Design an enzyme around this catalytic site. Structure first.
Site, PDB file in Angstrom:
ATOM      1  N   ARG A  54       4.612   2.404   2.442  1.00 51.55           N
ATOM      2  CA  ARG A  54       3.156   2.730   2.152  1.00 51.55           C
ATOM      3  C   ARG A  54       1.899   1.832   2.230  1.00 51.55           C
ATOM      4  NH1 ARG A  54       0.198   4.111  -2.902  1.00 51.55           N
ATOM      5  NH2 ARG A  54      -0.844   6.039  -2.355  1.00 51.55           N
ATOM      6  N   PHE A  59      -7.543  -0.424   2.129  1.00 53.49           N
ATOM      7  CA  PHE A  59      -7.389   0.302   0.512  1.00 53.49           C
ATOM      8  C   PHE A  59      -6.075  -1.022  -0.033  1.00 53.49           C
ATOM      9  CE2 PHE A  59      -4.112   3.067  -2.102  1.00 53.49           C
ATOM     10  CZ  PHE A  59      -5.022   2.101  -3.243  1.00 53.49           C
ATOM     11  N   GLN A  62       1.701  -1.647   0.516  1.00 54.43           N
ATOM     12  CA  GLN A  62       2.842  -0.802  -0.679  1.00 54.43           C
ATOM     13  C   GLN A  62       4.146  -1.181   0.118  1.00 54.43           C
ATOM     14  OE1 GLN A  62       2.209   1.592  -3.095  1.00 54.43           O
ATOM     15  NE2 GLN A  62       4.114   2.308  -3.813  1.00 54.43           N
ATOM     16  N   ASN A 101       2.531   1.388  -9.818  1.00 46.96           N
ATOM     17  CA  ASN A 101       4.208   2.052 -10.406  1.00 46.96           C
ATOM     18  C   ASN A 101       3.332   3.639 -10.793  1.00 46.96           C
ATOM     19  OD1 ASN A 101       1.801   3.276 -12.080  1.00 46.96           O
ATOM     20  ND2 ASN A 101       1.282   0.827 -12.361  1.00 46.96           N
ATOM     21  N   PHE A 112       2.255  -4.580  -4.582  1.00 44.93           N
ATOM     22  CA  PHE A 112       1.358  -3.855  -3.305  1.00 44.93           C
ATOM     23  C   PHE A 112      -0.261  -4.860  -2.759  1.00 44.93           C
ATOM     24  CE2 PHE A 112      -2.732  -2.618  -5.262  1.00 44.93           C
ATOM     25  CZ  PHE A 112      -2.544  -2.521  -6.936  1.00 44.93           C
ATOM     26  N   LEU A 121      -8.737   0.146 -10.237  1.00 41.57           N
ATOM     27  CA  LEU A 121      -6.643   0.139 -10.217  1.00 41.57           C
ATOM     28  C   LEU A 121      -7.346  -0.787 -11.784  1.00 41.57           C
ATOM     29  CD1 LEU A 121      -5.056  -0.029  -7.091  1.00 41.57           C
ATOM     30  CD2 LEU A 121      -5.874   1.763  -8.585  1.00 41.57           C
ATOM     31  N   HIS A 125      -3.034  -1.030 -13.170  1.00 45.52           N
ATOM     32  CA  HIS A 125      -2.159  -1.112 -12.789  1.00 45.52           C
ATOM     33  C   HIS A 125      -1.870  -3.183 -12.997  1.00 45.52           C
ATOM     34  CE1 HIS A 125      -0.714   1.526  -9.412  1.00 45.52           C
ATOM     35  NE2 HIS A 125      -1.882   1.962  -9.809  1.00 45.52           N
TER      36      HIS A 125
END
Ligand SMILES: O[C@@H]1CO[C@@H]2C[C@H]1Nc1ccc(F)cc12
Ligand SMILES: O[C@@H]1CO[C@@H]2C[C@H]1Nc1ccc(F)cc12
Length: 164
Positions: A54, A59, A62, A101, A112, A121, A125
């Site tokens: 991902r 951004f 991941q 998560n 990530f 986040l 996270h």
């Protein structure tokens, strides 16, 4: 002191280089230990041979799903999941290493690397390290992403381990 770990990454079988990460064992020892052991593979499973599944431009990148390779899997050295250790470290900018998560206290192996400040986040996270070297490699990984997270190339962690 804190461990230094590495990820040697390929894009369609061609090496991109090494991402070196400092694991903040000083702040989040349980989370840092989980990642460290998964890089060395000393528990009989880990990141070696798995992918960045991902990847979203502007951004993050991941990875960590070594069981299903699609975002549903991976596991920790403790069990299938472990609690959010603390939210002391913040998503301050590009290079931040944080846990992926599926809601509170669902940390596994998925993680990530931020390519921007992901401040929204914070408190959700667990931040547990940062890029020491190889942000050019993270930027190459990023360039193979899309808005959906789908990669245009197969991005593989060919080797990983502990430097110190
Ligand atoms: O309780 C649900 C079901 O199990 C975990 C935590 C939470 N959401 C979710 C989503 C994706 C996944 F792969 C795993 C999970
Ligand atoms: O058991 C937990 C919760 O479900 C899976 C496996 C593990 N970690 C994790 C992290 C992100 C995610 F999207 C899905 C998962």
């Amino acid at each position: 002191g804190n461990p230094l770990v590495y990820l040697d990454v390929d894009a369609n079988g061609k090496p991109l280089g090494r991402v070196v990460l400092e694991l903040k064992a000083d702040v989040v020892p349980k989370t840092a230990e989980n990642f460290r052991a998964l890089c060395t593979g000393e528990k009989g499973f880990g990141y070696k041979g798995s992918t960045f599944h991902r990847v979203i431009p502007s951004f993050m990148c991941q990875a960590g799903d070594f069981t299903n390779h699609n975002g549903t899997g991976g596991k920790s050295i403790y069990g299938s999941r472990f609690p959010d250790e603390n939210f002391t470290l913040k998503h301050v900018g590009p290079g931040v290493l944080s846990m992926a998560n599926a809601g509170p206290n669902t940390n596994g192996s998925q993680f990530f690397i931020c390519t921007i400040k992901t401040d929204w986040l914070d408190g959700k996270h667990v931040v547990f390290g940062h890029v020491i070297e190889g942000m050019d490699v993270v930027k190459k990984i990023e360039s193979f992403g899309s808005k959906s997270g789908r990669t245009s190339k197969k991005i593989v962690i060919t080797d990983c381990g502990q430097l110190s």
